[PDB]
Design an enzyme around this catalytic site. Sequence first.
Site, PDB file in Angstrom:
ATOM      1  N   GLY B 170       0.805  -1.205   0.000  1.00 40.17           N
ATOM      2  CA  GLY B 170       0.000   0.000   0.000  1.00 40.17           C
ATOM      3  C   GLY B 170       0.844   1.264   0.000  1.00 40.17           C
ATOM      4  O   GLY B 170       2.026   1.258  -0.351  1.00 40.17           O
ATOM      5  N   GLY B 171       0.220   2.364   0.423  1.00 44.87           N
ATOM      6  CA  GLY B 171       0.892   3.649   0.412  1.00 44.87           C
ATOM      7  C   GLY B 171       2.188   3.662   1.190  1.00 44.87           C
ATOM      8  O   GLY B 171       3.070   4.478   0.898  1.00 44.87           O
ATOM      9  N   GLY B 405      27.300  11.164 -29.121  1.00 44.78           N
ATOM     10  CA  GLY B 405      26.721  11.816 -27.961  1.00 44.78           C
ATOM     11  C   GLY B 405      26.979  11.096 -26.658  1.00 44.78           C
ATOM     12  O   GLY B 405      26.913  11.720 -25.594  1.00 44.78           O
ATOM     13  N   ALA B 406      27.266   9.795 -26.714  1.00 44.06           N
ATOM     14  CA  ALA B 406      27.625   9.076 -25.500  1.00 44.06           C
ATOM     15  C   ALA B 406      28.876   9.663 -24.864  1.00 44.06           C
ATOM     16  O   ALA B 406      28.973   9.732 -23.634  1.00 44.06           O
ATOM     17  CB  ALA B 406      27.822   7.592 -25.803  1.00 44.06           C
TER      18      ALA B 406
END
Lengths: 91, 507
Positions: B170-171, B405-406
């Site tokens: 649950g929460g 771009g890596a």
Amino acid sequence: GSDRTEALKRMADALDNYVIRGVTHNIALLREVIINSRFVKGDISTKFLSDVYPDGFKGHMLTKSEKNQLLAIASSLFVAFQLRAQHFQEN
Amino acid sequence: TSVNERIENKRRTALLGGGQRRIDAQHKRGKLTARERISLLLDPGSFVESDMFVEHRCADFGMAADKNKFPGDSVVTGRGRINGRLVYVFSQDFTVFGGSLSGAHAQKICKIMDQAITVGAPVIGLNDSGGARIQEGVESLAGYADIFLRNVTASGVIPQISLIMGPCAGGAVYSPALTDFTFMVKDTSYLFITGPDVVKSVTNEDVTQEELGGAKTHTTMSGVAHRAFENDVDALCNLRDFFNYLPLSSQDPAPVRECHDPSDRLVPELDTIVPLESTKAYNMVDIIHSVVDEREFFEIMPNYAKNIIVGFARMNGRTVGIVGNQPKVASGCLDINSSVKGARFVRFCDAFNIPLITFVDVPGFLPGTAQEYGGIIRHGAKLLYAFAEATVPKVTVITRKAYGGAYDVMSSKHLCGDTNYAWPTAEIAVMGAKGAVEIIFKGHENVEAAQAEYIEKFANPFPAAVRGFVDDIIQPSSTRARICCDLDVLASKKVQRPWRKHANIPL
Ligand SMILES: O=CCCCC[C@@H]1SC[C@@H]2NC(=O)N[C@@H]21
């Protein structure tokens, strides 16, 4: 060495001081052969390894005193690590 | 009876939690009680408890009966010391109403959190709770929110650590998600919003608790947990070890402890670790072990997104964060899970003033429709932003490839990096040599000579070095020494940025 004993002692000391990491190695067997009472007396043959280790190599066998020394060393090392864990710099 | 005697009675009752039979039931499951866990975690004789006599105030469904009143009410909270450093701890008691969260439970947790924020010390939470106490209705919900807010208020101020040691549904699962690190115990802890019964009822799926939210699931699939441990005892020992690394608050520098490993120790074993042929992989963890102090490395998410490696180590006794590509897995290509795993770790390290060391060997991003449909663009932007935003010292070493771009993402010097080094096998290029030659010289028949010249001139670290993109090309054996030196110079680094409430990182 100047005599056989000195040569065998310096070897045992050399095998204990040899660092090899990343592979398994036979130093444990070599070190046990060099200190073996038959080898030290010169009671040796081409069958020496089969005669001295029929079941197989199980590594050194500790005497009560050796076991106590090993346990004390391990405990001291553990406590030393735990103590160093507490030495932070000034905050 | 006198007031004193009632005091001893309440103390004794509280020390037993939900009763001896409940404690035995807990033990037969292979789990420790909350107080035993606290005793194991903290330095002996250092635990100071708070709010022992607090009891729930529910008056519905016969909850006001004396048999429903437990001093402490399913949570033990207080402060203590780990290796002499102050810490605040709460442990949930499963033997009291199944560890369900009530008003008093949340009140105690909030009190300790407020105290920790006031003094600036970390918070550790041992979670073992069924969920909200239904008998208290909306009250329980409120308490959860009261915790959540504090977590968000404490984020980036004091480190927060969660150890899931039992059921958690649950929460209640959301509070650990908001903390910096989450650890799980194997075979006795799990995390899920909805239990298996509701899953079967709604989606007609058959699954067990272990499959739905077990430690293995959250450490190998969902990327929710950071580490899994065998036992409560093992977990607590490793938790102490891990806590040794962190600073107490964001106002303090990275912890520095006594060091025996020389800072100038050479590492000759690295001179041939990288194979010459780019088609063979190696283990970056070996390099990390060689470089760091005493070869000690605390890895984070070791079994999740293995193409990247993140963890904590020490250089010259100073805590550092390690991020590195793993060529041994998927050629070391970046992807969604690895990007997220690296990004959050980098952000945490920056938030608490921990220097970063990066090892770069990356050919690019993983291709395919699965990565594109999964939003690889934003997830990779996450890691790129994490490096660009950091203001702690950043040291980068390129071992082999850095393409496209890596290369930019992996803490390139253009992201305001501090020192960037290249090994002799480094290759900084827009793309592979064959593809570059195909694009550039396509339409010319004498392809072979042009390709040979291109490989001779560009398939090396010289193009970057001549432009200053890397501070130097270093022998691998000296790596550690160099890094140590830099970390001493950069300890006083300070950077100015434009004001803002906060940035807007891609999510
Ligand atoms: O079959 C091989 C030819 C194409 C391989 C290109 C690799 S896949 C991993 C890396 N990421 C890219 O975008 N390209 C390279």
